[PDB]
Amino acid sequence: KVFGRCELAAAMKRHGLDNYRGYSLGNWVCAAKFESNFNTQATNRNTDGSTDYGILQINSRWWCNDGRTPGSRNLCNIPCSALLSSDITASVNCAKKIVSDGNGMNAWVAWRNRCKGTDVQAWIRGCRL
Template sequence: MTKVLLIYLVSCLLAISQAAIMRRCDMAKLLYKEELHGFEGYALSDWLCLAFVESKFNTSKISDNADGSFDYGIFQINSHYWCNDYLSHSENLCHVDCIGLTGIEWKLHCSGRPLSYWMTGCHLA
């Protein structure tokens, strides 16, 4: 199972099983447990920043889009097949790889900023 699919599944499971706003350190522990620290060169603080920007750690957040699709969960995964994930049938309407789109909010709100405070007080072990 690839990490992209894992991220999607974690997001979906969080939305189904907890349906709540997660605490920052609990989210850090979960991401650490799922071995996302260092994935694609991103630290846990990057993932935490992204989750906060997208959903404020709200696992049950659902956002509707003008095109009729919806964004679900803590990472706001889009329901419409608008990129190619190489795992399922995709219309790939934007002619891009899905992994290339995952950093848009991160670039706007997290990239180049000190992010160590996202891990402050979190004990992962």
């Protein structure tokens, strides 16, 4: 599913991302825009042989099992395919683990490079929330 901006903001709010670890909802919608273009089906293979999955491009090196990233972990205890569902529950739950790990939203390269330090409330402007 390719979400609209406000549709994603609502879904993310409902699943408890707004202000999760102190990151306002705009930061999560921004991250999703630049990680996946709001596409739950997005996949991108990394140089190390891991792959990033879903709306928040969660990586198989640490977070989900894809059956082809040897010696990786599965901290979210999910198949990576779960992160590609139209239902973002799995992705959000796993993002909460990630952002809690120590590095905050710097775990998302697109967030660091395109959202951090920017006016992220823009991403939730106009939305009914």
